[PDB]
């Protein structure tokens, strides 16, 4: 099987083979046939009476663990713990953002750059704004956001875009969210030996936990990031490994937390550091981003995107990365080993993510700019250790357009609003094209890479099929970066891949057929958008012809995302089977009974063409239900 559809990826894999270094593909091959029990989710290790493995085939072999737990119980608890872990990752990201908001000042390193956005958020949090200092407002907003994480009395605060009907449905179902850390703790408590042994209740607890990610953690992280670093607008950038410069210092930012990458971008324009880069013999400083931190700095500043998850190692294989600065999440620990074969400084900066044999330079949030300058100076000084004979940068990079926040999308939609009719600054043009049938629907393509799928193949095939079927596509994360590398994030792509209705819409609104809405936490934006459409049409989000796809997901964060997208009322297709096939009841809940609960359900489909067909059929049947 081919390892990737990306030619630059293939060239660097040949180079890695020539250099005698191992990749994620090599380790996947070394793992060989993976354990069937773990793959089906019928293995349990929740107590030291175990490990227990029960048969993935009902009626045969061992039926219960030592405590008496069935295959359905073991599967449901394993799934719930994946959701809890994903929720924890996203919530910790949002908590760091809220703490940064709490420390903003007029003369400090972290300021308020979008005051209108802050005032609207303050309105959503019942924070007074009129005749008040902007930083007093910011601190009050940060306090309310922080209380969302750990309040023990009262109800949490949810964005106004969330329909009232969806909230009432959640309350009736018993999944209405509480404080984020409280829900994570509840899931961890109920999976403990001898607690919850009922699959339906376990799945409902996991949905409840995932809601605190989708609508509170990721949402607050995104909106506070907009407040502090600016709301994204349409902006040009370049993507894929070709963005590395042979004659410049190459600094690659990998990870998820945006404050460090924002401070590194600011430090790169420091005159002393630019002079130092010149003095070490480089033309300048070339900042490139990877994964979600790359998505953030690219959405807000046009920083070039070096690559997505399964390309991180290959970035080092070029031999041109002088510094690789990482914060947390989706940072392959093998990088530490791999950087030994090159001059690269692999720099960890977060106390949450220590990696053995990496260079640890703790990013100081109290003095973010000075700390970022010190880290960047280490990366620049490493340019003297470059071995130019080992350097091979593929001449493969692609132009991309991104920055499509909800605000930017609304601004673009204002173009097709007749001034004599109005209203302006709404999602009404999008609602109109969806209701009329010019657009069949909207689909979110999100998720990681996975060695189980030819890298980027499923993302590209799913996106092309959807836009060919007049389904407008919004992309986040590594899927968005796969689209960027391929060339879908271009206005020209409208006439090259889109169907007639979507091509007309793209021409009228002057947008690409695929809209890059940011990082994984920025999936909250997608929720926001859908909610607005629903609120404009007076229906629940489960009545709309919308869907989400995770063609190549790998992370627990992806599991939590799919769970809260389904719980919000949006059908979700998974291109990689989650470890639930061992529990028939869990499969039936996720793919059949969920529709009775929340009006949406999971679809497991490993063939992208079949997934596109199923998405189109499901959207059409929801349209016929809605009468459009």
């Amino acid at each position: 099987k081919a390892k990737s559809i990306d030619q630059a990826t293939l060239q660097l894999l040949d180079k890695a083979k020539q250099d005698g270094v191992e990749t994620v593909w090599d380790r996947k091959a070394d793992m060989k046939v993976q354990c069937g029990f773990g793959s089906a989710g019928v293995c349990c290790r929740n107590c030291s009476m175990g490990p227990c493995r029960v048969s993935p085939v009902p009626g045969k072999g061992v039926e219960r663990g030592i405590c008496g737990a069935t295959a359905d119980v073991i599967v449901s608890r394993n799934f719930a713990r994946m959701v809890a872990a994903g929720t924890a990752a996203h919530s910790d990201h949002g908590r760091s953002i809220a703490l940064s908001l709490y420390h903003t000042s007029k003369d400090g390193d972290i300021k308020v750059k979008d005051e209108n956005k802050l005032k609207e958020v303050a309105k959503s949090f019942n924070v007074e704004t009129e005749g008040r200092d902007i930083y007093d407002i910011a601190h009050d907003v940060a306090k309310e956001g922080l209380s969302n994480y750990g309040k023990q009395l009262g109800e949490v605060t949810l964005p106004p875009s969330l329909p009232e009907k969806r909230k009432e449905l959640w309350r009736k179902l018993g999944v209405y969210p509480r404080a984020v850390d409280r829900e994570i703790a509840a899931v961890m408590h109920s999976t403990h030996i001898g607690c919850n042994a009922d699959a339906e209740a376990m799945i409902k607890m996991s949905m409840r936990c995932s809601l605190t990610d989708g609508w509170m953690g990721s949402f607050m992280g995104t909106e506070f990031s907009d407040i502090m670093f600016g709301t994204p607008h349409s902006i040009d950038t370049e993507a894929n490994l070709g963005v590395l410069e042979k004659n410049s210092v190459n600094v690659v930012l990998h990870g998820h937390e945006p404050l460090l990458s924002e401070m590194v971008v600011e430090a790169a324009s420091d005159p002393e550091l630019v002079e130092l880069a010149k003095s070490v013999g480089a033309d300048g400083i070339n900042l490139c981003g990877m994964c979600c931190t790359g998505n953030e700095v690219s959405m807000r500043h046009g920083i070039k995107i070096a690559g997505n998850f399964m390309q991180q190692e290959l970035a080092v294989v070029t031999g041109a990365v002088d510094g690789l600065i990482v914060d947390v999440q989706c940072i392959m620990p093998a990088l530490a080993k791999l950087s030994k074969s090159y001059h690269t400084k692999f720099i960890t900066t977060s106390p949450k993510a220590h990696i053995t044999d990496s260079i640890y330079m703790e990013f100081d949030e109290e003095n973010p700019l000075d700390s970022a300058k010190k880290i960047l100076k280490e990366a620049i000084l490493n340019f003297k250790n470059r071995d130019q004979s080992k350097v091979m940068i593929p001449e493969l990079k692609c132009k991309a357009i991104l920055g499509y926040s909800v605000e930017e999308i609304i601004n673009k939609l204002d173009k097709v609003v007749n001034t004599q009719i109005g209203p302006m600054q709404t999602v009404k043009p999008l609602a109109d094209v969806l209701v009329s049938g010019v657009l069949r629907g909207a689909a979110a393509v999100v998720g990681c890479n996975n060695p189980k799928v030819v890298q980027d193949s499923a993302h590209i095939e799913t996106i092309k099929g959807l836009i060919k079927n007049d389904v407008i596509v919004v992309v986040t994360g590594c899927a968005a970066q796969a689209a960027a590398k391929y060339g879908l994030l271009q206005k020209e792509a409208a006439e090259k891949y889109a169907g007639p209705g979507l091509a007309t819409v793209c021409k009228l609104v002057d947008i690409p057929p695929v809209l890059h809405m940011g990082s994984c936490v920025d999936i909250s934006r997608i929720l926001d958008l859908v909610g607005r459409v629903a609120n404009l049409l007076g229906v629940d989000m489960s009545d709309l012809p919308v869907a989400g796809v995770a063609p190549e997901w790998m992370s627990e964060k992806a599991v939590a995302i799919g769970t809260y997208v389904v719980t919000s009322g949006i059908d979700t297709w998974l291109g990689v089977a989650p470890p639930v096939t061992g529990g028939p009841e869990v499969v039936d809940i996720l793919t059949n009974k969920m529709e009775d609960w929340v009006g949406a359900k999971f679809f497991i489909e490993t063939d992208p063409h079949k997934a596109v067909e199923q998405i189109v059929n499901r959207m059409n049947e929801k349209r016929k239900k809605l009468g459009i």
Binding site: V416, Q420, V433, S436, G437, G499, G501, R623
Partner: protein, 290 residues
């Protein structure tokens, strides 16, 4: 019934009416009997633009229903909707041709029916010059004669060439609107199919001024969209046939504005209840400068 289904239903009704009237023409006059429009050089302009074929006898008119049949594909995609609008336009043209071959004088005053080529050439000079900054296709009935007269005279005072289809003709007559080719208020006919008589004005504008040869349908549609500043104001309740004819106008690149609640399409299908702002809304939608 959504927009696509409404357009498909309208196109099927137009096809049924065309089949009935063609059967009547075949029964009364014979398949060798001549089929023509008064003083034109492009036979039936819509069929000539779509296929290049000139319809000369009744048998060929009966064989032209296959064009309407092949232009109706009931799949909910935008291209099929535009093709279905074009099917309605072809069916309306066939109905008008059958009217002309059945009756010696199908239209009486003030209705003018078909517009001859010399009138098109006369209007071409002020069209490109800018003395005619647009073509207002008014179809249906306004709630009052006063509002219909007000809108029509507002368009007239702005130099636009306004064409009238339906009961709006009677409302304008009650409103003391002075009509004629020099007064730029042209009543086409009381039936919806009479709107084709302004559609052929645009089509022949591509055939005469644009120089596009017959059968180059995409070139004709591009020319009408980028050169002919026409728009539709549909007043009063809209049947499926009216919506299908509006889909044809959209296929020609002409935006359709109405006072009725319809599934809106930005820049193409717009609802404007306020009759005091309909003229400005249409001028903005068609990008017309006075």
């Amino acid at each position: 019934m959504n927009l696509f289904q409404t357009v498909f239903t309208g196109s099927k009704q137009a096809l049924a009416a065309a089949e009935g009237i063609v059967k009547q023409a075949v029964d009364e006059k014979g398949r060798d009997y001549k089929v023509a429009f008064p003083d034109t050089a492009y036979s039936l302009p819509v069929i000539f633009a779509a296929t290049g074929k000139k319809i000369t006898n009744v048998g060929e008119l009966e064989g032209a229903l296959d064009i309407v049949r092949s232009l109706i594909v009931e799949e909910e995609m935008l291209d099929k909707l535009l093709n279905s609008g074009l099917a309605t336009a072809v069916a309306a043209e066939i109905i008008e041709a059958a009217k002309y071959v059945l009756s010696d004088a199908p239209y009486a005053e003030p209705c003018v029916g078909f517009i001859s080529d010399p009138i098109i050439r006369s209007l071409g000079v002020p069209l490109v010059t800018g003395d005619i900054p647009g073509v207002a296709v008014i179809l249906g009935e306004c709630p009052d004669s006063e509002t219909a007269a007000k809108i029509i005279k507002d368009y007239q005072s702005k130099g636009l060439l306004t064409c009238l289809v339906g009961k709006v003709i009677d409302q304008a007559i009650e409103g003391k609107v002075k009509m004629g080719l020099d007064l730029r208020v042209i009543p086409l006919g009381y039936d919806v199919t009479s709107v084709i008589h302004v559609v052929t004005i645009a089509i022949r504008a591509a055939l005469i001024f644009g120089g596009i040869k017959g059968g180059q349908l995409n070139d004709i549609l591009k020319y009408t969209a980028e050169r002919v500043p026409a728009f539709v104001n549909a007043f009063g309740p809209l049947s499926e046939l009216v919506v299908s004819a509006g889909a044809g106008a959209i296929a020609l690149g002409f935006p359709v504005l109405t006072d009725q609640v319809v599934p809106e399409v930005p820049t193409l299908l717009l609802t404007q209840k306020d009759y005091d702002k309909m003229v400005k809304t249409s001028l903005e939608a068609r990008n017309i400068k006075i």
